[PDB]
Amino acid sequence: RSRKESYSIYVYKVLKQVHPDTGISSKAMGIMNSFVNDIFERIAGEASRLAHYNKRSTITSREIQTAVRLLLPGELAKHAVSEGTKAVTKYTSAK
Amino acid sequence: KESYSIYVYKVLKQVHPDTGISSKAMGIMNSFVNDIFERIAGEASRLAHYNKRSTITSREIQTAVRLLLPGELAKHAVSEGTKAVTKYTSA
Amino acid sequence: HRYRPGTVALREIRRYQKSTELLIRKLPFQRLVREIAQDFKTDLRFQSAAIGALQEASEAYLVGLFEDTNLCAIHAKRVTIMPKDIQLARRIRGERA
Amino acid sequence: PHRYRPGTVALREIRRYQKSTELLIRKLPFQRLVREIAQDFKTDLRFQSAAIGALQEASEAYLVGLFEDTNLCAIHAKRVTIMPKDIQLARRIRGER
Amino acid sequence: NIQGITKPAIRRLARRGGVKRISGLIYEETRGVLKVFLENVIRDAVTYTEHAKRKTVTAMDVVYALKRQGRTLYGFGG
Amino acid sequence: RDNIQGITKPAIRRLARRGGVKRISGLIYEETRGVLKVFLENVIRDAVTYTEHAKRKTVTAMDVVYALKRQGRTLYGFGG
Amino acid sequence: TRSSRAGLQFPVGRVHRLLRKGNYSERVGAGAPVYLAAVLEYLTAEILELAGNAARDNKKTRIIPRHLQLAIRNDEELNKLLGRVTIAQGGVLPNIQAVLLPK
Amino acid sequence: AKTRSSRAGLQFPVGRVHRLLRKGNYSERVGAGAPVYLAAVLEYLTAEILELAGNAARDNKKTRIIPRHLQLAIRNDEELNKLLGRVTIAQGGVLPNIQAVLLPK
DNA sequence: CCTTGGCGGTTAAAACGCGGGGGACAGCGCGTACGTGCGTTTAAGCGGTGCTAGAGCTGTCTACGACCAATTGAGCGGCCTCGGCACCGGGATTCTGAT
DNA sequence: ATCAGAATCCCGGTGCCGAGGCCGCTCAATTGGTCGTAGACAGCTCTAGCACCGCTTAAACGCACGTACGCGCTGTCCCCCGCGTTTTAACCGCCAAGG
């Protein structure tokens, strides 16, 4: 039996965080998995173009930041950059 | 940082051998060639990752050229590619 | 007795903006897709989920193109659609040359 | 004199501008507008001229396409006078809101 | 064939589009544009399955062909 | 300042004529200016962001090329 | 897990694996997947938060995809993002041109 | 024939393309026939479009191809126009589109 | 005793039909916004000229990353429960038109 | 306006079914340890981006003025809405089949 992938449990937990009293359909969970897929793919493609228009092959978080604020529209993007940056601080401040 | 200029000159002399060209015409042509190369190559990389094949042979390139260009161009391109495969494979 | 026209159509517009269920039902759509699919390589089997995907994408596609065509006709100082309206909308989007 | 009730002027200049090759918007005021928009997100930025020429090229092409579909909207409107909501309908259909 | 598309189907398409009043030649024009749409879609879908060396077009290939026409659709594992 | 008003009516005329437009209404020009402005807003925002990660205070033609390819309004001619 | 060590909810190393097998670069840094995972996390938080409000509207408990399409089509920046996006069981805006309403 | 270009009888450098594939982060490995195949496709595309370029430039008694020639030759094609639909050429312009409602009748 | 196949009941979205009514289309007449010219004013363009951030380009050392054995428990495949919606009749209400 | 009456909304009701809990696995994340060069950084050099101005001139601006498409209106005529009437695509059932 080949082991297949999903992101269902993760975003499921996130949904339980932001709304404890809320159910969901299974197809919509698949939709959100496809959503994460699509956003990830556009970001990664912008990362590869970041590489080739920078002639470098290392990926750091700075490239991810500039990729996100290339793709996403402004206000949403800046809030997301804030969330990611504070997470970078909280992780890399410890181990 | 190489452009494809004399390649264009030799194609041109193989087709309309009494024909000049401007500089920026060559620039637009090389822009064109790079765009086409990038589109096909990325589509082939999609073929690999959508098909879990760890490398790319010519068959992937054939089906990608099918996926990009429409009918007449596609069939003539498949013909030219297989003829090149044939003559390079013979020697 | 007889009702006055235009009313029932808009009432069922308000009804049909509600359920996202598929409008074209299955079997004839499947036959049409199979018949067009016949002329590329002979007799290919099909996943039914793929058929539902084709059905979904086709119906949403046509609904949106209708929306733009309808707004074209509203701009055209009229209420009824015309085929030339579809030609105008397609000429803006760029399917046909 | 030869005042000429109209028709040859506009269409003749269309013939001239479609015989034409080069730009129409002249350089300096467009450049200064570019730098004013540029002075809004990061200050004090320098530029090479070919970037600005590409910007001018794609700008005029963008507006040419707007004018073409606007023209066909007007022809469908049984008019030759353009309107603003023509352009609004054209950008509505182009998905560029 | 193509005439399996009923008149009230395209009417329902106008209704979910929200369109009120309907002309005549609309029907055959609709069937034509739908045909060309499905033609390009299923052509490159069968191209995908040709590379797949398999005798059933995957739903995955349908999804990826929609991506190839810039018509990205979620929902069915894409 | 006010280079948005540096857009001239005869330039809009010339663009309409190569655009093939015959008859010009008067309520068109500032609408045209606004659409052109929003266009160039998104363009130069993305180009400057590409140059932000470039760590060079000067934006190149190549940058604007890459950014407009990102919008899908992709233009040839200058390499990229 | 690094996600817990980042205090977040998305698995880092799965993403680090997928970055490797995507031919995305030659080498992969340390905390870039953390940043990307947090980006994903805030995105899905915002989306499904509006979806939760959409369920609050209809007084539904389980999310139907119609809620998702509606919440996409309401917000501005999200709809400009997902302009070329459609969803099965999507539907559209309940929208009527009042010039076609009767008098 | 020492060079693979002479071994293919073509005009493009193949090992160029193979290094482009290697310095592409495209696949992990690249076979031997794919770069030759793709380069042949490229060479066909060049010759095919330069045919329409040659006729379109010859339309105006000018030995040199200008960008306006290239845009004309593209828009006068059908497959290339649906190819280059999202595509714009520098110094291009568009076709003569004089509507029939405009000529003095 | 087993396949499996044309024949046939069940019925509901599917094709006619009329009539008409309200909406599409030609004309009518004006009229007031707008082409066109002409003279007048203006700013853009071009050619030099200083001219300097600053990109463009080159050694270098490191640390972070590439990569390799244990380990291990989280993530995953299977099972199992219940209350969440899907529809159904009640009944009430609100459009809609003839009045 | 205004009543009658279609059309729709909306409230228990029950049922059933899949969402979600749950639980025992095992394989990739981890943990730790070992080379290594890519890049962060220091610094050199010359280009080019910038600013400025003088001279030239063609290009814009304002107005004079007719005028003619845009538009509001009109009559009209026709042909889609819709409701009614068959009517045929389509589906579960199954008895002969032979075989």
UniProtKB/Swiss-Prot annotation, chain A:
N6-methylated lysine modifications at: K86
N6-glutaryllysine: residues carrying this PTM: K4, K13, K16, K78, K86, K90
Positions bearing carbohydrate: S82
N6-succinyllysine found at: K4, K86, K90
PTM annotation: Monoubiquitination at Lys-4 (H2BK34Ub) by the MSL1/MSL2 dimer is required for histone H3 'Lys-4' (H3K4me) and 'Lys-79' (H3K79me) methylation and transcription activation at specific gene loci, such as HOXA9 and MEIS1 loci. Similarly, monoubiquitination at Lys-90 (H2BK120Ub) by the RNF20/40 complex gives a specific tag for epigenetic transcriptional activation and is also prerequisite for histone H3 'Lys-4' and 'Lys-79' methylation. It also functions cooperatively with the FACT dimer to stimulate elongation by RNA polymerase II.
Residues with Phosphothreonine modification: T85
Residue(s) carrying Phosphoserine: S6
N6-(beta-hydroxybutyryl)lysine: modified positions: K4, K55, K86, K90
Alphabetical keyword list: Acetylation, ADP-ribosylation, Antibiotic, Antimicrobial, Chromosome, DNA-binding, Glycoprotein, Hydroxylation, Isopeptide bond, Methylation, Nucleosome core, Nucleus, Phosphoprotein, Ubl conjugation
Residues modified as N6-malonyllysine: K86
Dimethylated arginine carried by residues: R49
Quaternary structure and partners: The nucleosome is a histone octamer containing two molecules each of H2A, H2B, H3 and H4 assembled in one H3-H4 heterotetramer and two H2A-H2B heterodimers. The octamer wraps approximately 147 bp of DNA. Heterodimer H2BC11 and H2AZ1 interacts with VPS72 (via N-terminal domain).
Family: Belongs to the histone H2B family.
Protein name: Histone H2B type 1-J
Organism: Homo sapiens (Human)
Curated annotation (Swiss-Prot), chain D:
Residues with N6-glutaryllysine modification: K19, K42, K78, K85
Record-listed N6-acetyllysine modification sites: K19, K42, K78, K85
Residues modified as Phosphoserine: S20, S49
Residue numbers of N6,N6,N6-trimethyllysine PTMs: K19, K42
Effect in UniProt of substituting R91H: In BRYLIB1; uncertain significance; decreased protein abundance; increased interaction with DAXX; not changed subcellular location
Domain of life: Eukaryota
Protein location: Nucleus; Chromosome
Phosphotyrosine: residues bearing it: Y4
Annotated disorder: Glioma: Gliomas are benign or malignant central nervous system neoplasms derived from glial cells. They comprise astrocytomas and glioblastoma multiforme that are derived from astrocytes, oligodendrogliomas derived from oligodendrocytes and ependymomas derived from ependymocytes.
Name of the protein in question: Histone H3.3
The organism of origin for this protein: Homo sapiens (Human)
Higher taxonomy: Eukaryota, Metazoa, Chordata, Craniata, Vertebrata
Full-sequence range covered: 39 to 135 of 136
From Swiss-Prot, chain E:
Part of the intact protein present: 26 to 103 of 103
UniProt keyword Hydrolase, yes or no: no
Coarse class of the protein's main subcellular location: nucleus
Modified positions (N6-(beta-hydroxybutyryl)lysine) in chain numbering: K7, K53, K67
Residue location of crosslink Glycyl lysine isopeptide (Lys-Gly) (interchain with G-Cter in UFM1): K7
Quaternary data: The nucleosome is a histone octamer containing two molecules each of H2A, H2B, H3 and H4 assembled in one H3-H4 heterotetramer and two H2A-H2B heterodimers. The octamer wraps approximately 147 bp of DNA. Found in a co-chaperone complex with DNJC9, MCM2 and histone H3.3-H4 dimers. Within the complex, interacts with DNJC9 (via C-terminus); the interaction is direct. Interacts with NASP; NASP is a histone chaperone that stabilizes and maintains a soluble pool of Histone H3-H4 dimers.
Recorded GO CC terms: CENP-A containing nucleosome; chromosome, telomeric region; extracellular exosome; extracellular region; membrane; nucleoplasm; nucleosome; nucleus
Keyword Transferase set for record: no
Organism phylogeny: Eukaryota, Metazoa, Chordata, Craniata, Vertebrata
Keywords: Acetylation, Chromosomal rearrangement, Chromosome, Citrullination, Disease variant, DNA-binding, Hydroxylation, Intellectual disability, Isopeptide bond, Methylation, Nucleosome core, Nucleus, Phosphoprotein, Ubl conjugation
Modified residues (Phosphothreonine): T56
Compartments reported by the entry: Nucleus; Chromosome
Result of changing K67Q: In TEBIVANED1; results in severe early developmental defects when expressed in zebrafish embryos; results in defective cell cycle progression when expressed in zebrafish embryos
Name used for this protein in its record: Histone H4
Residues bearing PTM Phosphotyrosine: Y27, Y64
Gene that encodes it: H4C1
Curated annotation (Swiss-Prot), chain H:
Main location, first listed in the record: nucleus
Residue numbers bearing the N6-crotonyllysine modification: K23, K105
Modification after translation (UniProt): It is involved in the initiation of both imprinted and random X inactivation. Ubiquitinated H2A is enriched in inactive X chromosome chromatin. Ubiquitination of H2A functions downstream of methylation of 'Lys-27' of histone H3 (H3K27me). H2AK119Ub by RNF2/RING2 can also be induced by ultraviolet and may be involved in DNA repair.
Location in or out of the cell: Nucleus; Chromosome
GO biological process: chromatin organization; heterochromatin formation; negative regulation of cell population proliferation; protein localization to CENP-A containing chromatin
Keyword Transmembrane helix: no
N6-succinyllysine carried by residues: K82
Gene Ontology CC annotation, any one: nucleus
Location of N6-(beta-hydroxybutyryl)lysine modifications: K23, K82, K105
PTM sites of type N5-methylglutamine: Q91
Cross-link (Glycyl lysine isopeptide (Lys-Gly) (interchain with G-Cter in ubiquitin)): K2
Keyword Ubl conjugation: yes
Chain positions with N6-glutaryllysine modification: K82, K105
Keywords: Acetylation, Chromosome, Citrullination, DNA-binding, Hydroxylation, Isopeptide bond, Methylation, Nucleosome core, Nucleus, Phosphoprotein, Ubl conjugation
Modified residues (N6-(2-hydroxyisobutyryl)lysine): K23, K61, K62, K82, K105
Molecular-function GO terms, alphabetical: DNA binding; protein heterodimerization activity; structural constituent of chromatin
Protein family (similarity comment): Belongs to the histone H2A family.
The protein's assembly and partners: The nucleosome is a histone octamer containing two molecules each of H2A, H2B, H3 and H4 assembled in one H3-H4 heterotetramer and two H2A-H2B heterodimers. The octamer wraps approximately 147 bp of DNA.
Protein name: Histone H2A type 1-B/E
Protein species of origin: Homo sapiens (Human)
Source taxonomy: Eukaryota, Metazoa, Chordata, Craniata, Vertebrata
